[PDB]
Design a protein around this ligand. Sequence first.
Ligand SMILES: C[C@H]1CCO[C@]2([C@@H](O)[C@@](C)(O)CO)NC(=O)[C@H]1NC2=O
Ligand SMILES: O=C(O)CCC(=O)C(=O)O
Ligand SMILES: [Cl-]
Ligand SMILES: [Fe+2]
Length: 280
Amino acid sequence: RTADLERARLGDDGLDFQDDAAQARAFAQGVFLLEIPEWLDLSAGDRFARQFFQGTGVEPYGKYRDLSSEHFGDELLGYHSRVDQLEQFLLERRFWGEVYPSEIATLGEHLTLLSHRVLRSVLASAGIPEEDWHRASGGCSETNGSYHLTFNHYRSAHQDIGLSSHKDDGFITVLRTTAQGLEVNRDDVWEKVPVDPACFVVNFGLSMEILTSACVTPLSAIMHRVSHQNFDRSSFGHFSSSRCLPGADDGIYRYLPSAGLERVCGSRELIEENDHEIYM
Ligand SMILES: C[C@H]1CCO[C@]2([C@@H](O)[C@@](C)(O)CO)NC(=O)[C@H]1NC2=O
Ligand SMILES: O=C(O)CCC(=O)C(=O)O
Ligand SMILES: [Cl-]
Ligand SMILES: [Fe+2]
């Protein structure tokens, strides 16, 4: 029914779970709760998620409904109506300063540095050598990855599932949710993720699963979905991927213990393949 997730916070040494066993469960499941720093203001992001889809009559964020992928030269970006209840606004970090409201780009930057700290804690626990982190993470072990700040709205009038079962593409997703609907399939049973507006939900994407698939303790990309919503719902997430610019793709790698990194596919290629199976 309801998943019982481990809870972590970022501290002086990195990710702090209650004990080492709890960290191992969290990383093995591929999903856990992360305490939101008390200084971090999420209210503008919350408002953007409630407004982005409403058009230019609605201030200050409704106008982002009018920015489609054409305006960015990148089919992933801008406003997208999906086949499920979900509609989205997606923007990669290279456009945040120019295109997002200033306070929304600020939020994106805070989340990038928090996620960077989360990812480095995970890479260390996997025993991957530090000098391989940059290439293994497509730049996300520093701040050279591809980062999408993505706003979600579930149109409860559409007779669809909220968002189909899927795995995220990348290494780390930091998910901000304040209402029921998110479900996870940790072990062949769907379970509700408990709502705690004081925590983010963190999960691993396909790139984390590929990277660690040959390690002693492989880490999984959690299968998750959003159930059919009878009232409206919104949320947003920060997604870290191997640099996947249209002209500069850092590739997707698997770590072979005692050997090094082996290339599996392209970063954008993984995203296109994954977006395909999610929706059709
Ligand atoms: C890379 C980018 C686009 C790909 O789509 C995802 C995907 O999780 C989803 C469900 O939001 C697309 O609808 N969203 C992102 O922001 C990012 N990662 C995803 O997996
Ligand atoms: O809205 C949610 O809670 C989840 C959204 C999600 O999983 C995604 O956008 O990839
Ligand atoms: Cl609509
Ligand atoms: Fe997701």
